Amino acid sequence: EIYCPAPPQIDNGIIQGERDHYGYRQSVTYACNKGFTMIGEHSIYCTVNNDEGEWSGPPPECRG
Amino acid sequence: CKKKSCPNPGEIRNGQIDVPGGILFGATISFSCNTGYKLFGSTSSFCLISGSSVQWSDPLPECREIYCPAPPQIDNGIIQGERDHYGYRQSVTYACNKGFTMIGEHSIYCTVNNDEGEWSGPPPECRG
Amino acid sequence: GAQVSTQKTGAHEIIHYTNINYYKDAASNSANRQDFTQDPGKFTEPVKDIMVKSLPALN
Amino acid sequence: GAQVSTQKTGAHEIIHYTNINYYKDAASNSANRQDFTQDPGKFTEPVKDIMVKSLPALN
Amino acid sequence: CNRSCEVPTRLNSASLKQPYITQNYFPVGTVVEYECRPGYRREPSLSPKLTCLQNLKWSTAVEF
Amino acid sequence: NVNSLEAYRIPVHSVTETGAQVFGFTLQPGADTVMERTLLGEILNYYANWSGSIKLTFMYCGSAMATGKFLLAYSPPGAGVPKNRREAMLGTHIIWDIGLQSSCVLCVPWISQTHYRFVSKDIYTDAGFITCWYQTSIVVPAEVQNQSVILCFVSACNDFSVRLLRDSPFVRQTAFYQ
Amino acid sequence: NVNSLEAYRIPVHSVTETGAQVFGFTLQPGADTVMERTLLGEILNYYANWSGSIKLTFMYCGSAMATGKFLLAYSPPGAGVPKNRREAMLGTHIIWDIGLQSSCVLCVPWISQTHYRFVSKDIYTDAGFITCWYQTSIVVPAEVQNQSVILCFVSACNDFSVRLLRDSPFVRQTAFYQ
Amino acid sequence: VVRVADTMPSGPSNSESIPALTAAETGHTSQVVPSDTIQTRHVRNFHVRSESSVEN
Amino acid sequence: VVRVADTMPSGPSNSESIPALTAAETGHTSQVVPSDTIQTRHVRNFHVRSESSVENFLSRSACVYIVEYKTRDDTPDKMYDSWVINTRQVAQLRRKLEFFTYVRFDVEVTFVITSVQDDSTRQNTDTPALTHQIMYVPPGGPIPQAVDDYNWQTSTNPSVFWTEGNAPPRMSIPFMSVGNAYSNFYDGWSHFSQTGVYGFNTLNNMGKLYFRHVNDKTISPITSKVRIYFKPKHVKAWVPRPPRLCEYTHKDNVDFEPKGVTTSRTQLTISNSTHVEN
Amino acid sequence: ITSVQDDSTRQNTDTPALTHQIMYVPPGGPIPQAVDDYNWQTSTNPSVFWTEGNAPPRMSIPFMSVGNAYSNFYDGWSHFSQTGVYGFNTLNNMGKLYFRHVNDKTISPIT
Amino acid sequence: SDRVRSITLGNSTITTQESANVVVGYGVWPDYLSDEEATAEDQPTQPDVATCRFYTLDSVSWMKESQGWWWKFPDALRDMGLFGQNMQYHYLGRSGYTIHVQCNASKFHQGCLLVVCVPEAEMGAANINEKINREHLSNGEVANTFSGTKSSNTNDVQQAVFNAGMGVAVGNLTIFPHQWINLRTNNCATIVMPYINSVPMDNMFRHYNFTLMIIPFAKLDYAAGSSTYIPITVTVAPMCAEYNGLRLAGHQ
Amino acid sequence: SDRVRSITLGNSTITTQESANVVVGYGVWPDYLSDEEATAEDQPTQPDVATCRFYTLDSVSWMKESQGWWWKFPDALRDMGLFGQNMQYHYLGRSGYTIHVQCNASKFHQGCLLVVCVPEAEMGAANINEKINREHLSNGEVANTFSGTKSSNTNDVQQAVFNAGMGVAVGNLTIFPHQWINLRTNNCATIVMPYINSVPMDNMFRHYNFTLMIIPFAKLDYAAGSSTYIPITVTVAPMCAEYNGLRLAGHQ
Ligand SMILES: CCCCCCCCCCCCC/C=C/[C@H](O)[C@H](N)CO
Numbered sequence A: 001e002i003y004c005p006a007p008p009q010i011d012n013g014i015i016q017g018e019r020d021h022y023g024y025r026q027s028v029t030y031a032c033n034k035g036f037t038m039i040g041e042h043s044i045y046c047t048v049n050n051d052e053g054e055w056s057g058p059p060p061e062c063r064g
Numbered sequence B: 001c002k003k004k005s006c007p008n009p010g011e012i013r014n015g016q017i018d019v020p021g022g023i024l025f026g027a028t029i030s031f032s033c034n035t036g037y038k039l040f041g042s043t044s045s046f047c048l049i050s051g052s053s054v055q056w057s058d059p060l061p062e063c064r065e066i067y068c069p070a071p072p073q074i075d076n077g078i079i080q081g082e083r084d085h086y087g088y089r090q091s092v093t094y095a096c097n098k099g100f101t102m103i104g105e106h107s108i109y110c111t112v113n114n115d116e117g118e119w120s121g122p123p124p125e126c127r128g
Numbered sequence C, D: 001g002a003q004v005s006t007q008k009t010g011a012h013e014i015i016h017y018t019n020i021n022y023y024k025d026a027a028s029n030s031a032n033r034q035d036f037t038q039d040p041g042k043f044t045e046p047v048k049d050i051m052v053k054s055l056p057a058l059n
Numbered sequence E: 001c002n003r004s005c006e007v008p009t010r011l012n013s014a015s016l017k018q019p020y021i022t023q024n025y026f027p028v029g030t031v032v033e034y035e036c037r038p039g040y041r042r043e044p045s046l047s048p049k050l051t052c053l054q055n056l057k058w059s060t061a062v063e064f
Numbered sequence F, G: 001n002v003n004s005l006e007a008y009r010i011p012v013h014s015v016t017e018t019g020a021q022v023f024g025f026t027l028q029p030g031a032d033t034v035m036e037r038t039l040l041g042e043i044l045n046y047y048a049n050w051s052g053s054i055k056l057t058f059m060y061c062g063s064a065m066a067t068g069k070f071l072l073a074y075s076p077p078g079a080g081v082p083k084n085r086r087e088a089m090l091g092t093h094i095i096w097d098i099g100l101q102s103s104c105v106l107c108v109p110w111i112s113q114t115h116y117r118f119v120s121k122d123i124y125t126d127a128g129f130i131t132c133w134y135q136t137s138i139v140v141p142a143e144v145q146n147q148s149v150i151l152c153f154v155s156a157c158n159d160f161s162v163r164l165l166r167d168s169p170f171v172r173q174t175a176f177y178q
Numbered sequence H: 001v002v003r004v005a006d007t008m009p010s011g012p013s014n015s016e017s018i019p020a021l022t023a024a025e026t027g028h029t030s031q032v033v034p035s036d037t038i039q040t041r042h043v044r045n046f047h048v049r050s051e052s053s054v055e056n
Numbered sequence I: 001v002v003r004v005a006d007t008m009p010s011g012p013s014n015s016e017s018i019p020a021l022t023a024a025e026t027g028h029t030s031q032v033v034p035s036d037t038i039q040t041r042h043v044r045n046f047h048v049r050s051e052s053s054v055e056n057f058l059s060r061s062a063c064v065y066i067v068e069y070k071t072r073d074d075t076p077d078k079m080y081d082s083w084v085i086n087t088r089q090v091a092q093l094r095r096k097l098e099f100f101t102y103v104r105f106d107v108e109v110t111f112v113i114t115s116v117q118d119d120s121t122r123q124n125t126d127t128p129a130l131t132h133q134i135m136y137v138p139p140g141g142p143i144p145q146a147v148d149d150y151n152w153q154t155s156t157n158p159s160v161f162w163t164e165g166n167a168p169p170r171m172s173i174p175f176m177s178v179g180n181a182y183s184n185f186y187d188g189w190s191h192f193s194q195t196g197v198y199g200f201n202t203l204n205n206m207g208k209l210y211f212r213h214v215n216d217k218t219i220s221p222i223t224s225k226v227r228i229y230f231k232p233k234h235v236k237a238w239v240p241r242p243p244r245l246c247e248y249t250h251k252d253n254v255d256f257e258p259k260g261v262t263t264s265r266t267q268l269t270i271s272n273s274t275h276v277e278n
Numbered sequence J: 001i002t003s004v005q006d007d008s009t010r011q012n013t014d015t016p017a018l019t020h021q022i023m024y025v026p027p028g029g030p031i032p033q034a035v036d037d038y039n040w041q042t043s044t045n046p047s048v049f050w051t052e053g054n055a056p057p058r059m060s061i062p063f064m065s066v067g068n069a070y071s072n073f074y075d076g077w078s079h080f081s082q083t084g085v086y087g088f089n090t091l092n093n094m095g096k097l098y099f100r101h102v103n104d105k106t107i108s109p110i111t
Numbered sequence K, L: 001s002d003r004v005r006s007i008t009l010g011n012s013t014i015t016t017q018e019s020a021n022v023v024v025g026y027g028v029w030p031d032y033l034s035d036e037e038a039t040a041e042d043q044p045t046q047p048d049v050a051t052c053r054f055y056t057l058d059s060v061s062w063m064k065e066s067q068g069w070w071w072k073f074p075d076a077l078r079d080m081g082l083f084g085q086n087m088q089y090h091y092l093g094r095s096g097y098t099i100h101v102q103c104n105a106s107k108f109h110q111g112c113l114l115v116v117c118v119p120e121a122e123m124g125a126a127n128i129n130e131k132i133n134r135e136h137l138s139n140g141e142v143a144n145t146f147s148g149t150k151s152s153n154t155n156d157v158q159q160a161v162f163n164a165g166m167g168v169a170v171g172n173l174t175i176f177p178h179q180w181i182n183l184r185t186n187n188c189a190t191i192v193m194p195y196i197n198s199v200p201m202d203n204m205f206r207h208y209n210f211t212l213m214i215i216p217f218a219k220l221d222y223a224a225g226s227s228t229y230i231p232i233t234v235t236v237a238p239m240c241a242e243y244n245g246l247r248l249a250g251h252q
């Protein structure tokens, strides 16, 4: 089974229900703390490129 | 106030759980194993009080498998494909050697009487 | 609004009675003990290719 | 001075009854439990410019 | 001093045997057995036993 | 044989001397022990008077090579039970040949002096006897089983009637069922 | 939220993953806690049998720029409660597009084996489930509030009927009111 | 008033008509009138199946 | 006999006809037949809206008050009892009438009278059959003050005598109101300066009943209890009303304790049961 | 309805005529819990009052069933998983009757 | 000759050369539910010939001391293809049935069978005040077996042939639609049951409609040398089946 | 106004308030096979409304840098109830389809989708002379995703949006029955495909009839503050479906 690596932690914001292993088509949803504003897409998902696990985009950011 | 709920009893492997009157406080569920299986443990449980909540009075029972004993060997004749364990409704077919004549039914099968394994009839015989 | 039927009587040797319904419901009425019909053709003779009773009904 | 109406009965399988009024007042009579009509057009659809139910009824 | 039944049903052709004819205190589930009164014979289609039920009454016993 | 299916199987075999007897009972549907718990007897025990004719059907459940004849006979009361074959051939009898049509119908007519008979036992309305006699034998070929089984049916005709509602003498209750 | 106006407001917002659930309840007008004290439920608790179809109206009380689709679905009983969106699209469903016409009608038909169902809870006349599922999402422009509110109505059709007068299980009195 | 069926008279017979020989294996109750096996007489029967009905 | 509406058969549809999309903002209940969204079959329906009509809903003999009075008491005020006539001291018939705002009906009235021998030393008597008197006073008439008053002489007042052991008394009363219908709810005052008493208490004005034993003072105390059964008939009702949620507190107003809307839940979605095991 | 004076010391009384109440509860209604409960107030439930010494009470009841006929025999289960209670006990659902003396507590026991 | 009978349903055909007479029901032929007696409102699914066809159950071996067999037919046809699937996705169902029971022997054999269809055969428990398990009533396509003496297995049916499980005399079971398989002259145990219930459509899993019983009254008996293995095969076809109330996959 | 459209099939209903115009096929409406063009001989199963109804597929999330999605419809409807079961027990099948694709946004959003039904979309492999696995073509109800740059996963489809997998210019895909979901003015991606094949009935598992594709040409783009999660839901209903050649349970 192919696994994407560990999901990136964002500054000032957590992951809703972080799982241990992330396979194909599986997504993490980034929440955001009190007093900070989301920018961009909430969720990124796992892709396979050149038989290698890889997340689809950059993770979002909370400025506040 | 209103009654508390005992947790969901779930499933017994090779058995039923009969819930006639809900699973509230003061309920009753019963237990039964299928054909070819025997119940070991408790036959009913109550949604009683345990501590600060409600629990079931008896743990979940077990359904073991009932086996008829070893099939009888006949004189001058063999069993076609003798298996090791014989459960419910399963039959052995007696063949017969060269120069000997069968008498009676070829095959006997396993029955359960008084929760005990037992073959259905006497085995046949080869005279020659 | 009355209705007149016949009384059950002996044979070989037509007297009428009267009946008036008083209440608004059909469950209130007296029981209908004067229906004498029957049809035992669904319990006896319950077959297809109806037999003749004079033929052997086989072969 | 009697009047004959029908009894309430089951469906899919006209029995009459009789009624005579005895007293001089209209409050003395039996209750009228056989009026089954209705008109829910004043509670539902209580509008002006009556809608069509196939058109969007706006714009 | 548990719950007990009554005296078993006196039949005009059957009397009790002799562990049961004297003793009182019939608990629930207790089976009693009758014998033919001396001049009579058994009907083989009927079993001469009586169980006392939960409501402290015997089962139906008619003519053994 | 009450506590098995063998209550319904009437034995028949090959006999070393003809003219014997096969079975017999007393024609009292509701009082006699034979047809007491039958469908006609259980309808008929809620009553107290009966009338009309009664049919009797005899299915031979044996081999296809076996053959033989029987004497299905009804004898009206007034005399005793017949003891020979030649006394029972004086009644209302039928000789039944076993062949491809494997069942016969003995129709017992209505021979009475009163319009009704009692479903219970009294001596004023005795009703007769039903006996069956070997006419020749059972004859089988080799390697065919001799001992076979006759099954008996019972029904009512299109002129059968019952009169007086009473309770059945079989219902028995001691305490309430709870 | 019983002790406020928020019992009537169903939450809806933009979701980071489609195919989720919005709400759900059990179709029992008079036994289920959701439509217990409704007008149809309060007429219907003085009875003991009911029959006919039931309508359900969903008013979207949100912005005028917001748009999205929902899956209003009824599933007849016999199986469990559906747990995915693809199990609840096997029932009797309707896809509702939010547009200028801001309300839809989910008409729950009469699927039964008996002519009536009980207004109370018994297992012989279970009646089904009503669930609602995000079909795509809520999509809003900038500087428009995401979190909006759906309101649900209930009514009866022109073939609805009730049968057995009983007293309501909600009236309670201890002493005389003086 | 629906009376019971009557008995019609009969005589001797020697033919290939066999009301007695039936097949009870066909799930079929035979309908042998008593005038089909023995010689009967004309009996006008006045019995009524009244108190055997389901209501009675 | 007016049957319910039938279901007509339907088929597939792909058109600009949209029965589902309505506007519930126009104060309008949508009239979507079940044959308009799904494919239905021909069902000839035989159901009758009979026992949901207003006459079949209200014409039951309900109960309104219990009245107790003794036949030998030292105080003269417990030898008879009274009751000012309203229908608002038992919650069931009150709630059923408060489905509607204005009602108009005739009342069929039944009394169910039971006597209990009270406790005393000399309790072994031989008492003949008791006789009761039930006197109605129209609004404004003279009221009794004792059991031996001469105001009980019923020359104009309708009064009903009953002997113990017979059928209960029953009499009908016509529409005894000064308006065109009764008022279940009255949002106004008694005085023209918008003072005084508030609510439906200005419009009761029904008079009162009086109960006594016709017999003389017995040698042992017996209490009797009489139950008034009103039973409305020839009923019409206008401008309906949502049924009352909270519980009643008094008979002369609508004052209440604030109750929530309904019974609570644990979460807003449904799922399968999470009880014991397989 | 028949009444028997039970055994007590004070057995010499002078009792007036007893009155009985027979109340029917449809399936699902509120049930009484005492003789002085206010659930006996029969506003919707049909109840029958009887005074000792008269003709016995008699009333007719129509076809109170939810199916097209009654079921004397039912070969099935209560729950759709073929569990629960077996037989005709699922289809009874008839409600129940309640009986009390309308009179107050007397000075001697009468059953 | 009328000993020959061909029955064609769907894509299956049963031919018999030693039939006697086909019985059909209480006089009623199976037919779809009319819209004057219907209760449910949505369009029913009368599927195809895809369910109205013959399905073969398992065979039981009829020995000298065998006693009886029974089946439970809305439950016994639960895995026979599209009938089983349309049972598992619908809430209501309704069907008549054409049951054809086979058994053959030679002319030197003897023995008699009784083939009854018993509506609403409510079975009794072995020990009295005790629950019955669902596997002891209906075992799918597998026959449950009566006994000769009374049985006392826990959570089991009281299975004595002289009471037929229900508690009546077994010689009174000829009031239901029946035939006899006399090995002298029969193979035609054909019984066309109409739909018999007190509601116009019913659930397939929760309710058992009827019970087939094969009870040998005159036992199988043969001379030495004949074939001792005599099987009995039961073939059943639903007729005029229709379904209503589609939802997700049911209770297996 | 003609912006409102109601579609009723079976027991399901889709209402749209911002529709534009329903497309129907190559001019042909779906219809059952006539008996002048039929090949198989036994009676077909036109089941009920039990299969001709809307089924909801899974939703995909349309992000700023998403590229495209595709499905394979006689294989994508393989577990949707009785359509899936009648697929699994029959040898031949035949059906038209009514595809309704939903997507909504606000008036402050922008972006454009292309919704095509492509018959016989024979996909090309990523590495050239190498087999394609069945999971990379059709993943049931789950959409497979194109890419922007060329892909080189082993045993995978060459998935570039500027060639659409087949090897043509993607701006030429407007020759098939299509619409546009412009978020300015649409939600009505409704396309009523008739049955298009070179044999009158065909197998459901062995042959893929067509391929839905959702390709965003003008990408989704929005200002900061609007709802960033915009789902796309595809709903599909078979029409005039019939089945033939019943046998045992098929290939899962
Ligand atoms: C001699 C027997 C006379 C008995 C007098 C008792 C009843 C007379 C009073 C009239 C009954 C009016 C019923 C109540 C009227 C209104 O509906 C209530 N105010 C509630 O709105």
Ligand SMILES: CCCCCCCCCCCCC/C=C/[C@H](O)[C@H](N)CO
Residues within 6 Å of the ligand: J022, J023, J024, J046, J047, J048, J059, J061, J064, J070, J071, J072, J092, J094, J097
């Ligand atoms: C105020 C008087 C009301 C008295 C209520 C007593 C009877 C009401 C119950 C309805 C009677 C139903 C009779 C039984 C129905 C079925 O035949 C049985 N379950 C047996 O099948």
